[PDB]
């Protein structure tokens, strides 16, 4: 009997497939994310300098109040 | 299992702006003065004529 090198192929390793598909990201959608977080970025920001405002003149009041110094 | 590990690289290297940015526009020669020089693989293979040995 003569043994050699079998052949086999099965699945045939698929000649040639694209793996690079789009992903998450679609176009518009990622802006309506992205501009989203800038307004929702400002009106939480201007909301604690309001808040700074309430401490600025109690600050600048002490100063006002002590003329002993 | 080479068939994802060559597709890796086009994820890595062909999709990215640095690759577009870089390698685009670098002596683009597909004439006749182009064949007058003769590579036979790639250059002529990879742009131009249809020519191939195989």
């Known amino acids: 009997x003569x043994x050699x090198x079998x052949x086999x192929x099965x699945x045939x390793x698929x000649x040639x497939x694209x793996x690079x598909x789009x992903x998450x990201x679609x176009g518009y959608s990622m802006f309506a994310v992205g501009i989203g977080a800038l307004l929702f970025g400002y009106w939480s920001m201007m909301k604690w300098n309001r808040e700074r405002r309430r401490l600025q003149i109690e600050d600048f009041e002490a100063r006002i109040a002590l003329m002993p110094l | ?54």
């Open chain 2, 1 to 54: 299992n080479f068939s994802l590990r060559i597709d890796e690289l086009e994820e890595m290297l062909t999709n990215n702006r640095i690759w577009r940015n870089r390698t685009v526009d670098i002596g683009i020669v597909t004439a006749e003065d182009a064949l007058n020089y003769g590579f036979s693989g790639v250059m002529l293979r990879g742009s131009g004529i249809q020519w191939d040995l195989r």
